[PDB]
Amino acid sequence: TAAVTTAWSEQFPNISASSTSRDINNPVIVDYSLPYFENNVPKDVGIYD
Amino acid sequence: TAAVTTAWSEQFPNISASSTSRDINNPVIVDYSLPYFENNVPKDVGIYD
């Protein structure tokens, strides 16, 4: 209603990563199902393979 | 009137950048006109494009 000029601000509530560097965190999770009472389980994934 | 010798000084009121490194600041500004009461606006420029 009052289209007045505002002050400069670096505080972008959520600026796109297409305009600047932005932190993201999406760790991959490996599941090892245990459907039975006594399950057959493998050794942890050897990520280096 | 008194053409006397003066002391050495590094305090150049404004030495040319042709003689030494000089700081400059000229950030580019992107305008997104809002001429109407209800404007059609684009997503912030994707500088990486």
Automatic annotation (TrEMBL), chains A, B:
It is found in: Host cell; Virion. It comes from the Viruses. This is Capsid protein VP. It comes from Bombyx mori densovirus 1. The chain holds residues 377 to 425 of 672 of the full protein.
